[PDB]
C-alpha cells in the first residue's frame, strides 16, 4: 500500500594501474577538515593508514606533490599557512622520493599487489609560530601524484 | 564564534530502513577499486526495517536497473550489484515475510532483526580492468508494506 | 611511467581565542542527517563528545544558538519541526548560558587550555507533539555561538 522509496548516490574513482586506498579497504576522502587549537596553538593532524594497490608489484613507486600544499584564506589569499604531507614515513613534497617493494612490504600484506600498511599524515601551521593565525576560513588542496614505471 | 552544523532529515511515517546502530543510512557511497584484485570493495552495512506495522510483509525492489557511469563518458559502464536481507535485489520484487524479519526476536516493537545491505560493482568483462575515470550511479530502493 | 594524481581539499576553520572541538581532537562535522523511526515515532539524537579549546582558561564560557533551530521541510518552508540542542548538561537557546571555567573542568583535564568532556546532543521532534511527521526532505542549521566571558 505505502511506497518507501531511497535513492543512494554511489560513485567510484577508478584507476586501473595504480591507487591509494585506506587500509581498511575504502576509497580515501576527497576533503578533510583540519581543527585548529588555541590551546596548543597547533593543528590536529588528519592521519590515516592507507595500502599502495597496482597491477605490477614489480615496479616502483614514486610519489610527489603536483604543487606545494597552502591553507589560504578564501577571503584573502595573502593569508596562508603551510600544509605538510607524510606517507610512509617520507615527508612528501613537489621532489619525487621512490619507494621499493621491499619498503613498501608487498609480500607481508597477504594480498597480490597490495602493499603492507602505510600511515598518510596531512597537517598545518601557522607560518610563523608564537604568532597566532588570523581567523576565518581556510582552504587548500593536496595534490597527491603518485606514478608507476620501470 | 559562529560554528553551524547543518542538520537533515528524511522521513517516512510508515516504513523507512535504519542502520542497525540507529543512524540513518547514508545519501550516498564511495566504492574502491583495487587496480591489484581488479575488484570493487563492496559497501556492506545492516539494517533494520522501522515499520508501522510489523504483522505485514515487505517488498523490496530496485526501481531501475542501477550502473557505474563515467560521469565524461555516458557510454562506459560497470554493473552494480546490490544485496538486502541475504537475497540479490533487482526490477523485480522479492518479498520478505514478517517471520523471516524476527521482528519478535528484535525485542523493539515494529523494528526487525538486523538485514545486511551491500551494494558492489565489477568490471563488464572479468580479470580485465575497467578504464580510467570517475563513474556515478544511483541505487534507487523501493521498499513497501504488503496489504 | 603512469601517474594517478588524487586530489584532497583540505579545510579549517580558525579562530585563535576559543573552539569547540570533538575530544578526540578532530573538528566538528560540517553536517549531521537524524534517522527517524517509524516504529518508536521519534527522531534519533546526534551526540558528539566535544571539548573547548582556549587561550584562557580562566575565562567563562558563554554559548547561545544564533537562531531558533529548524527541521524545515525542503518542498515546504512551513512545515518546521523544532530542533533541540543541548551542550554539557544544559539545553541552548538564543538567550545565552554561561560556564564557570571551575565546572568546566580545565584542571581536570590533562591539558593546558582544553575542558573537559561535553556532550553535544543534537535532535528534532514533530511540529505537533503526538502526531507523526508528513513524508519529506528536511533542512536547518545549527547556529552556535561562544565567546568567553570573565
Redesign the interface.
Given at each position: 500500500?505505502?511506497?518507501?522509496?531511497?535513492?543512494?548516490?554511489?560513485?567510484?574513482?577508478?584507476?586501473?594501474?595504480?591507487?591509494?586506498?585506506?587500509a581498511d579497504?575504502?576509497?580515501?576522502?576527497?576533503?578533510?577538515?583540519?581543527?585548529?587549537?588555541?590551546?596548543?596553538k597547533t593543528?590536529?593532524s588528519?592521519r590515516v593508514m592507507t595500502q599502495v594497490?597496482?597491477?605490477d608489484?614489480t615496479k616502483k613507486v614514486?610519489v610527489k606533490l603536483?604543487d606545494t600544499?597552502q591553507?589560504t584564506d578564501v577571503l584573502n589569499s595573502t593569508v596562508q599557512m603551510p600544509?605538510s604531507v607524510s606517507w610512509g614515513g617520507q615527508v612528501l613534497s613537489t621532489t619525487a622520493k621512490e619507494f621499493e617493494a621491499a619498503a613498501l612490504g608487498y609480500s607481508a600484506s597477504g594480498?597480490?599487489?597490495?602493499s603492507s600498511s602505510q600511515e598518510l599524515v596531512?597537517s598545518?601551521a601557522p607560518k610563523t609560530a608564537g604568532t597566532?593565525?588570523?581567523?576565518?576560513?581556510?582552504?587548500?588542496?593536496?595534490?597527491?601524484?603518485?606514478?608507476?614505471?620501470?
Open positions: 500500500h505505502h511506497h518507501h522509496e531511497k535513492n543512494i548516490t554511489v560513485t567510484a574513482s577508478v584507476d586501473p594501474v595504480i591507487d591509494l586506498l585506506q579497504g575504502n576509497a580515501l576522502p576527497s576533503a578533510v577538515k583540519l581543527a585548529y587549537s588555541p590551546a596548543s593543528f590536529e588528519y594497490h597496482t597491477n608489484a614514486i603536483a600544499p591553507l600544509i594480498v597480490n599487489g597490495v596531512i598545518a597566532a593565525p588570523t581567523a576565518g576560513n581556510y582552504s587548500g588542496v593536496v595534490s597527491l601524484v603518485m606514478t608507476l614505471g620501470s
